[PDB]
């Protein structure tokens, strides 16, 4: 309860920093989320390892949206 009323008291800066509406594309479609990594090395067993310099991957696929999200479903 204390941390929730503190969260509500510090109100406008959350929506100030999380301006999700700018991220949306022209056709009102949610852009996807992309994962990054650098200097990865996996050892399969002894005498066999494999190292990549950087890697990238898709977390969730892009899809349509009707209204932008906010911080309330995340942090409350």
């Amino acid at each position: 309860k204390i941390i929730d009323e503190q969260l509500n008291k510090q109100a406008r800066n959350l929506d100030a920093i999380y301006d999700f509406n700018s991220l949306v594309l022209e056709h009102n479609i949610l852009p996807p989320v992309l994962l990054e990594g650098r200097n990865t090395l996996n050892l399969a067993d002894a005498q066999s390892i494999r190292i990549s310099d950087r890697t990238y991957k898709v977390a969730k696929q892009a899809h349509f949206i009707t209204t932008p999200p906010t911080w309330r479903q995340y942090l409350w």
Partner: protein, 51 residues
């Protein structure tokens, strides 16, 4: 849940909407106990019971 109002819903998503000639709105969406509405440039919360 289907809601008839005149303001604009913000938070929980909405499956479909319809607007009158007078600007009043009707929304169809999934059930939620609490909705977010920008009333007159100021945000506002609404509590739903009986779900």
């Amino acid at each position: 849940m289907y809601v008839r109002t005149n303001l604009t819903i913000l938070s929980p998503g909405w499956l479909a909407s319809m607007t009158s000639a007078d600007g009043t709105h009707a929304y169809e969406m999934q059930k939620s106990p609490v909705l977010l509405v920008s009333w007159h440039g100021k945000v506002m919360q609404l509590k739903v019971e009986g779900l």
